[PDB]
Structure prediction request, 1261 residues.
Amino acid sequence: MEVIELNKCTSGQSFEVILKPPSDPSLEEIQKKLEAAEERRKYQEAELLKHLAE
Amino acid sequence: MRECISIHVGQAGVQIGNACWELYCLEHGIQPDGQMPSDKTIGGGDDSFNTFFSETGAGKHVPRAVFVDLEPTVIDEVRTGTYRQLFHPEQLITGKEDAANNYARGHYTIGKEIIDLVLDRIRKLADQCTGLQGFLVFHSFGGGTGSGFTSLLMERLSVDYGKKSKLEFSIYPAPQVSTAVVEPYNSILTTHTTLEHSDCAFMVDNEAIYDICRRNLDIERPTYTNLNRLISQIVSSITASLRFDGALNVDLTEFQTNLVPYPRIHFPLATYAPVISAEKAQLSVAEITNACFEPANQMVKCDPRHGKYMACCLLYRGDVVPKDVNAAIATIKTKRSIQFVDWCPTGFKVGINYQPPTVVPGGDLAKVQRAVCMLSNTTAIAEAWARLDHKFDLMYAKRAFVHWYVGEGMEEGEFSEAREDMAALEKDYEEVGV
Amino acid sequence: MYTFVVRDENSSVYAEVSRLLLATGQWKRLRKDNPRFNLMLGERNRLPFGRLGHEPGLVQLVNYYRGADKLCRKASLVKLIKTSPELSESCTWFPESYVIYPTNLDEREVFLAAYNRRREGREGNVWIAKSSILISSEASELLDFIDEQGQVHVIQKYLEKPLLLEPGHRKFDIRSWVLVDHLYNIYLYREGVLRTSSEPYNSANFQDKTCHLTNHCIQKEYSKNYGRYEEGNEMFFEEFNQYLMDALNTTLENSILLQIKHIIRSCLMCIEPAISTKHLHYQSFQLFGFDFMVDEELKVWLIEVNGAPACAQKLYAELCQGIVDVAISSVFPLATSIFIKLHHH
Amino acid sequence: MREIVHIQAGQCGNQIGAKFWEVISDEHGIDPTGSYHGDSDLQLERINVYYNEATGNKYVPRAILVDLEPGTMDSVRSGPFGQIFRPDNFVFGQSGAGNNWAKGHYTEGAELVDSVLDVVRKESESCDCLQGFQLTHSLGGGTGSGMGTLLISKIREEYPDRIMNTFSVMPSPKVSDTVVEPYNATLSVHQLVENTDETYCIDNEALYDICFRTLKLTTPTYGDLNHLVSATMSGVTTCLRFPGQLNADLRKLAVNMVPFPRLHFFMPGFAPLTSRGSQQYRALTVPELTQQMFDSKNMMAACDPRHGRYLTVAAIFRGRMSMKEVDEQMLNVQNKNSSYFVEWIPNNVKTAVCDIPPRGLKMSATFIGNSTAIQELFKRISEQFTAMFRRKAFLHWYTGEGMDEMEFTEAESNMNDLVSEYQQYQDA
Ligand SMILES: C=C/C=C\[C@H](C)[C@H](OC(=O)NCCCNC(=O)c1cccc(N=[N+]=[N-])c1)[C@@H](C)[C@H](O)[C@@H](C)C/C(C)=C\[C@H](C)[C@@H](O)[C@@H](C)/C=C\[C@@H](O)C[C@@H]1OC(=O)[C@H](C)[C@@H](O)[C@H]1C
Ligand SMILES: Nc1nc2c(ncn2[C@@H]2O[C@H](COP(=O)(O)OP(=O)(O)OP(=O)(O)O)[C@@H](O)[C@H]2O)c(=O)[nH]1
Ligand SMILES: Nc1ncnc2c1ncn2[C@@H]1O[C@H](COP(=O)(O)OP(=O)(O)CP(=O)(O)O)[C@@H](O)[C@H]1O
Ligand SMILES: Nc1nc2c(ncn2[C@@H]2O[C@H](COP(=O)(O)OP(=O)(O)O)[C@@H](O)[C@H]2O)c(=O)[nH]1
Ligand SMILES: [Ca+2]
Ligand SMILES: [Ca+2]
Ligand SMILES: [Ca+2]
Ligand SMILES: [Mg+2]
Ligand SMILES: [Mg+2]
Ligand SMILES: [Mg+2]
Prediction:
């Protein structure tokens, strides 16, 4: 039951109690992901419009 | 002094952000017009509250906050609210039509069109900072914007601010108050993409808050306003060390240092006490501390008796001295089931702020003389991932609602990829705690 | 209308509970994966406790206490007793035991130090090795047996002086069924059973494990005198109490049941803070089977605690009705108790 | 400012559409001249979803009235609220469609559709943020069925990323106009499977049986059936017209209600269904509203929900009531009849409350169910189609407009495929 690192100020205080010792994707890669998804949307829409044109 | 920037995404993020900044103003003595009479350094300074507020030459104290939502109605409440004068238009970003509870729509379809404007507005706040710490990101798991756009934003912030910390406050979906059926999809899609980009995430289960509001506030059918004022109290307890004088959790890095030894396991469990009804016509230090080990007071319902602790932080506000805290911990050790992992010291980091919790006038919460928020990193919170992953499995086996996501340009393989990542996360929790 | 699900098809006990609930007309059984249940009769292994108590507007109950395995495993029971101050290493009603891991993976040196003390002091030095069985008086033969396996074992002092029934000069053990409800009331079923050996106890040969092991499955296959003295090697309390009166001028209640009740209450009160569902978002009850041995001085020893016990064939109807009445109907009410409440505070 | 463009086509579509606009104009406090005389701010908060603002606080329905003969639209214009519709939004021909899908879809309707799209384009161009379109029509006739599905196809081509929503009246032999209605409905249903996101299936037989059995109306009229539809349409669109969090717009509603693109045909329902006299002024209770809402006798698709399983359910309660009691009774219907809700869509029953009840009622309730039992409706139509088509009966009416038998064979195949799709998920 040790209390260490007791720091006190006017607004409060803090300390620690020890009871027992122990025993990214780049901007270019993000754009390709977003643009590839946009491409798949546009492909599916183009297929729909081809279906409606028929 | 080192600044923090708050980002509020989607309906849940914006409304919780609005409740938080209301509370921050009441805690710091800031009037709705932005003036702060107790601030004697007009036009600037490097006080602790300046981490969240910048200052104009006229003496207005402006939150370091950005609000993003893909439809205008929620942010319009900010523009015309009580604290409308705190914010300037560059801080509020809105779109026309929302993500329709569809992760793919918030991440790919709409996110692609609005991400550069959001980053630009964030850069304008960041350019006001002499030593920016990082970001606090507020969002829901289940909303299309809260899930989809947030994960895109986190990826981009890691690119533009590689050395900066990012903390999450995330709203875990509860059917009691839920809008959509697909929220298990959005939750797991956004956790997978955000996981490597968040240093510490505080999950709040709407089920837990809803039940704390029924049980302890006697509100029969809680509203978002009821939920958001209790959430903002917990958030205020977590961020209080960044905004006041102190020595514990004084910068965002210390949150990871004190609570997250394993980077993927970065979801601490929050527990808060006491929640007392204001309609009710005073608990001790030992009693509020004991209440921290009751599942009924946790932000996520789970059983920490059947997990293992990695870190524990006690954040008191009010009439609390260290002597009574240590006496409480000693008594609780000989009664409760508190197992730590073998490679961590069985202990607690305690922070005391003498200022008792501020309550919004006319709110549901009674004024108390002392309160505590416990942040414990326990493997028990993995139960919330198990619940979420099971609902995902039930729907995905029939591919129910999947066509909505593929129709927005998402591939089916991102579902299984996200689900395999969550299976690994569940395995990581099991290896640590069992 | 109450709903329940069944997730352990091999359960003798809760197959009868399931049919009794249906016979009341007020319980509907659902598919095993339907989450909208009031009652889960769960699986034995890896019961998803984490998914219980999150269905809005449904009081949910499960027939297992999460964490009770600590009491219902050989190795865990030894560790629980040695490390719990309520039980402690000086516990008088549990035989001296040691947890021994095989060398291909511990209390080896602790066991051998106690074994040397007995071998030195001319005391009886017969031990038994069991796990998830070899009876011997040589420590080397016990350790080599465990190294051939790959799981955790326990070495336990063998009760060399058991109480032997007459005629037959034969060993037995007592099984008590205990029901703990959602309020952590402890209910001892008033009917127990004595699983008896049909072979005369022979302390000069621990190689033939049939007069030494009282298991019903062991007697039914190896004992050539199976069923000679009592039907199925099962003696019930009425006959056993009559025997203790005629042969030893005492009663079952005084000489044995007092200790049995004390042992049941000590074990379950010890783990109550770890497993209680008093303030949890779901509720648990569980049926346990305690196993006891009696020595010739009428001292009762706890041997093991079973977490998914079977019941005696003639006692299924009575016990399974009592489970419905105090454990299930107490939470989900319908439109002279067989249990003995062991009081605690 | 999420606007919806309403279209009503044909005799049935315009007569039901007229009553619908009459009912909601009263709810939003709009008189027949387009003036607001309400007493609540809730009446105007989301009124732009269905109404445009004209000079001097005048509210004009964003509605387009379409027919191939003038008769019914002359009656609408002479009706009570007929003066409130935009005069330029009346688009009609003179020849009629003779209860013939081919006439509506390929010949007579093809001559009129471009001028309808000019009015649709003009209304969409004034929308700050167009949600999508709402079409009311029948499937048994020629204009609403044939030209209606032609309009949907052309609107989808011009507005491919907007929600398309229909209230579609399914024909029944019990309430029938001509023998060719199964042909027209089978041709139209295939159009709806491909080009709508949500279709509310209103079966005229169920409406009739409700008026006769439950309401004790001895001889129901089309007027009685249409008022029942209008009440149901007012209830289902309450989430769109008033402040609310659930199904607030068409796309969120579709994301919540449609787990598979082709299985988007809903069974609606209304409560209370009360007979006049005596027990008529009785105060309604939430338990009674709820039991009525899920009773088979009260559903308007003439499908027994006990013969299938609900994929998704949206229930909307209107009036000042206990939202706690609403949750309790709603959780009591599922937890007691869990055999009729699929278990692989968690929490597939959503409930909303709105404080404004329909005029003259303390409270009411509308039910929207995506149930696999709807296959019974498509099976009935398919059987009546095949009984005639096997002998090529009445086909000359269609081949004379340029169709050939192959197109009928494909429409038949498509609807039998739709039936098989529902049966797959009923046994999941
Ligand atoms: C044939 C039954 C006619 C009426 C039955 C009894 C039901 O009506 C009621 O329960 N009305 C409440 C009791 C009478 N109250 C009042 O007179 C009254 C007066 C003033 C204020 C008031 N409260 N308020 N406010 C109530 C009604 C809700 C029916 O259950 C329902 C099936 C009627 C409908 C939708 C259609 C029937 C088939 C038509 O024939 C229609 C023309 C008959 C009556 C409608 O005018 C009916 C209308 O309709 C609505 O659209 C809408 C739901 C509401 O306005 C519906 C009152
Ligand atoms: N606690 C709390 N939860 C909220 C609030 N608003 C929404 N939620 C929850 O968030 C989820 C809905 O997500 P929203 O944040 O509304 O969705 P969004 O992020 O705006 O995304 P879209 O609307 O789909 O573009 C549901 O689980 C709600 O219960 C709020 O103010 N407080
Ligand atoms: N320390 C000991 N001394 C004397 N006899 C013992 C003993 N340990 C076990 N036995 C005898 O050996 C048998 C072993 O069963 P044990 O209690 O070890 O669990 P088990 O898993 O083998 C079957 P059960 O559930 O019926 O107890 C006992 O029933 C008893 O007859
Ligand atoms: N409910 C209802 N059904 C109608 C009405 N008028 C016609 N119908 C039905 O609609 C079908 C006839 O289509 P109709 O709209 O008259 O033909 P159209 O004008 O060519 O579209 C038949 O099934 C009729 O039973 C009406 O006012 N109400
Ligand atoms: Ca200053
Ligand atoms: Ca990083
Ligand atoms: Ca012509
Ligand atoms: Mg939103
Ligand atoms: Mg055993
Ligand atoms: Mg007509």
About this structure: Residues 164 and 298 of chain D are 26 Å apart (CA to CA). The interface with chain A takes residues 153, 156-157, 160-161 of chain D (CB under 8 Å). Residues D 10-11, 141 surround magnesium ion (ligand 10) (CB under 6 Å).
